[PDB]
Design a protein around this ligand. Sequence first.
Ligand SMILES: [Zn+2]
Lengths: 293, 107, 49, 98, 263, 49
Amino acid sequence: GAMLDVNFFDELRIGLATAEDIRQWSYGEVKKPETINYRTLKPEKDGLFCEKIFGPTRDWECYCGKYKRVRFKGIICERCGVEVTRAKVRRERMGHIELAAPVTHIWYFKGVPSRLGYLLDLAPKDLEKIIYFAAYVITSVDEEMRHNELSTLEAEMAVERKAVEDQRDGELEARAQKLEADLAELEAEGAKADARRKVRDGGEREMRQIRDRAQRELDRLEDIWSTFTKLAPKQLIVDENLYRELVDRYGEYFTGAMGAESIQKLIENFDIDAEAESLRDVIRNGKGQKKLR
Amino acid sequence: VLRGSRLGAVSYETDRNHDLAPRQIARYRTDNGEEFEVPFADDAEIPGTWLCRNGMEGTLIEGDLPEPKKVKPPRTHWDMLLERRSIEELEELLKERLELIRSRRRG
Amino acid sequence: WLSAASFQETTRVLTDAAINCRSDKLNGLKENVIIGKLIPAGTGINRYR
Amino acid sequence: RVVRERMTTQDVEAITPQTLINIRPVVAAIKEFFGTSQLSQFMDQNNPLSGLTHKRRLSALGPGGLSRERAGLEVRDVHPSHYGRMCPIETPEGPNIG
Amino acid sequence: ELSERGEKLPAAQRRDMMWICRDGDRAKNHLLEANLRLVVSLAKRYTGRGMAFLDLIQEGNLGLIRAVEKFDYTKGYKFSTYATWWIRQAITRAMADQARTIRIPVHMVEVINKLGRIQRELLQDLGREPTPEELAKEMDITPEKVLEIQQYAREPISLDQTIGDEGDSQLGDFIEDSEAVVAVDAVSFTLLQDQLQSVLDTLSEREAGVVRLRFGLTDGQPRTLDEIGQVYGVTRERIRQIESKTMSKLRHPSRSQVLRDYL
Amino acid sequence: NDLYRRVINRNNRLKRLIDLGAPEIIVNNEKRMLQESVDALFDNGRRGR
DNA sequence: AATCGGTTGTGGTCAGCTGCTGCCACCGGTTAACCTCCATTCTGCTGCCAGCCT
DNA sequence: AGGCTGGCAGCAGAATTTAACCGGTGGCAGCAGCTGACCACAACCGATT
Ligand SMILES: [Zn+2]
């Protein structure tokens, strides 16, 4: 409504400014961390005290002194760009910084209750890890492609696990050959009856540790497969290596990111009416911690 | 008593509204289609490009000026490589890497 | 919102007045002091003014 | 800290104590204690009694001791072990009593 | 270059080349990631003067990128030997650009650091704070240049710090705005405008118009004698003569007694 | 001015790293620093030191 | 005799570019033994773990 | 055989180390070389009462 503030106000309304509001209030983008010159003590162009953005420092003058009276009132100097007008407009003109990466507002993330956490249904601890680049979040998943290629990907995983177990079988054969060589080179020569079992005990330890390596690698492959089969949006992936294995093998079918650009993609893929309807069904039917939450 | 000045001047004039100098309005257009109006003085040469309120330069809307040209970077990683290598040395290195990947994949 | 933000918990009041998109009809005794007009009491009411 | 820091750079058998020592932080520490500290105060010169009572003063607040708003009502009391050591009578009457 | 003006190659060769094109980027990333720890250990020396630790690390990382670009493997040196120069240069030039609110350029920061080392050495080896003459003779400049540099080396104080000890009053509540309207000068100027208009009004019409158009008392634009002469149809010397006679009239006590108090 | 200058310094350096093609360790460290500087501009000490 | 306006002989004069001629700030790029991680009180929310239920 | 709910305890917010070359370019700053208009003292006129 009013902006000059002549005192007929009816209301004062507060709201949440979007980026179009911010870069519509602004009179220019500030793009240098400079304030004033160290020698002449006059403001620097594009800096934090710039006259082309915030208005002139002296009443009815430009910056280069080319226009210097009220006869030239309201024009812009074609050289320096300073609009010649009053110097008290430097209490009224805003500028803006255009960020190269999105940033969350601290007021809507941090302070209890976390309003971003309540809207998206993320815990504050799981939200801090995303927006401060310590974990990934699944922004999207594909259900048609996953449901139509699940069988083929299961076949691929079974093939690779078969190859791993065949590798362990080859190691079983090779260490059995070395064990039989140890048997022939220990039982047919005179030594301690316990010392001929120490080398075979070391061989059995080698077999135990090698099949333990194979078991841990098979467990890691099962973990990757279960993680892909239970993939849904708003799901945190700590273990950067697990995320990298997921994007390596199944790089389609889902997307993920860290930070406030992922938070803003989750807010883009957010259905306010459907979420409100499901919450109202919960508060009508269910009871307990679910209803209070 | 501390006394400071934000280094500016305050003039004592009557702000009139009638006897003012004439002005002409230009119109500029940035690379995302935005449009801005700038009031220049009537006896003044209108510039070709103007830094607008988005912080991006906008060209003048009247089709007259063939002004902007290339101001190309003379410093890329290829330039820094070329000032210390030769074409035949780089070609030998490329062919050795190609033979290694042929021996690796094909053999 | 303008008389509740100046009472206490300014940051919490302003951060959900913005989410609820609240509007302030300036009816009170404290919101007229802040913005600088006549309080709606005493001689500042339309019967007497 | 600066002694170790410029002991690692410089070549050994070419260094000496006046090349290792930088006395500027010691000078600045003593200077910023004596000016701009809470316990280094302008001397109370109204009369000789003000002067003599500004020395022989035991203040419980300062850098390293309790604040004024965060101090409880229990440290502002007179304790029976103050007999002969601190005066129960002479104390400020403002928001510093005790 | 080949994809410029067409010139299609075999598809096996095209697939072969793209592998080394992406492998080069992988190698460059591997080299940078291997030497980031060198950047950190080199950048921890500059903590405590203006910049924060992570700003120093990131400007060192820009320097390490250029050391990767300019590295020559045929000279047979280590990577860290060559890269330490570029990392140190990037950290020091960034600190010169970004340490202070009012930005002093790099060459002036270099002479300020030079004067600082000189002053520390003289205070150590002299037992006394050296004079500007001793500093200017040690550094080969004039004794006023020393004071100019020493006054450019001053950092601002904060408007938001508590200047009290108990009242919780900041500094900005003690600084008088020396450029506000004084509210008695602004009404004295108004009454001066009215009185000057009265004294000019009690002259003749053309005689008052000459002085008003000469001094620009109507539009702020002081015209010249030839402009007023073509305004009234008169010549320049006659305009100057009647202007001199009106100044003689206005210098009278009967006119200037009411205006003597306004100076 | 110090808080605004931190925001502008880290934003300009992030633009340099993105157009330089730096690895994601460096780019993510720069983005996290930019986020913390804007947080310190709006509400200092709310999250961290 | 004056009197309101021109003409101007002539002598400074006074700053306004105009070259112009240094010259001096200001900013970018480079440097190649080797050495790699910094008080008290009240209120509300969020996570923990036993304990009955199918 | 497991599971989801009740106190329960812990935590957060609000109130009263080191420097130097080299290239190159734009800004500065000072000063004759015109000015080109300004200023002025004085003198010489153009009708006109
Ligand atoms: Zn201008």
